[PDB]
């Protein structure tokens, strides 16, 4: 079967710059008249969406900033000016011989401007406390770049465990990340302390930011 090799694996591009991604087929996928290579865009959580068919034909509804070129074995997809919504993995696919196969994808990342997080803290809900567990949530919203440190302090003491973090993909409208950190304690443990705080470090801030509440 035909193998499609995409490059680069990840392309990092500043807002509004041109992006070019490559797909090379292991053997010729064009006739003397047409090329049987197609391009798809897979946004986070979504199926692939067809962008370009037969190397160069823009699918109806697809933005004009997308174009494709090439013939033979070497194909390219170009985004003339990258927009936040273009954050996605892009795949090529041939239909020359059977079976159709796909490339391994190129991830398009966007190097937007530096942004400090906005920080919020949420005590456990009364409904959850009725079940015997306390989840405390710290939200870091809309920051860039990804690197961030979150520490939990309970009555000023650094917590050594019992939290978990998750970070989003780059946002579809502004290219930032957000991060949640959840501290989970038994109700009894929760009720043995007074002050719950999360301390956040990020390069867009010149000192750590602490958000806290008193139980």
């Amino acid at each position: 079967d035909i193998v499609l090799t995409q490059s680069p694996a990840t392309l990092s591009v500043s807002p509004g710059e041109r992006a070019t991604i490559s797909c090379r087929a292991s053997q010729r996928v064009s006739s003397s008249t047409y090329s049987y290579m197609h391009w798809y865009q897979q946004k986070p959580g979504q199926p692939p969406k067809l962008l370009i068919k037969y190397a160069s034909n823009l699918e109806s509804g697809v933005p004009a900033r997308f174009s494709g070129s090439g013939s033979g074995t070497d194909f390219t997809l170009t985004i003339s000016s990258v927009e936040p919504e273009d954050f996605a993995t892009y795949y090529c696919q041939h239909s020359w011989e059977x079976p159709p196969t796909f490339g391994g994808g190129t991830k398009l990342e966007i190097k937007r401007t530096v942004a400090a997080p906005s920080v919020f803290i949420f005590p456990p809900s009364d409904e959850q406390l009725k079940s015997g567990t306390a989840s405390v949530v710290c939200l870091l919203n809309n920051f860039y770049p990804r690197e961030a440190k979150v520490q939990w302090k309970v009555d000023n003491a650094l917590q050594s465990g019992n939290s978990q973090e998750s970070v989003t993909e780059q946002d579809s409208k502004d290219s930032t990340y957000s991060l949640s950190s959840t501290l989970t304690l038994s109700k009894a443990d929760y009720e043995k302390h007074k002050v719950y705080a999360c301390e956040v470090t990020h390069q867009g801030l010149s000192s750590p930011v602490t958000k806290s509440f008193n139980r």
Partner: peptide, 25 residues
């Protein structure tokens, strides 16, 4: 899952914005 609120407050703002959510556990 169980679903719990992450309640907002006008007393807990950042830049005049509030945050709210749901915890799906």
């Amino acid at each position: 899952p169980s679903v719990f609120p992450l309640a907002p407050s006008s007393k807990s703002t950042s830049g005049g914005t509030a945050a709210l959510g749901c915890l799906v556990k």
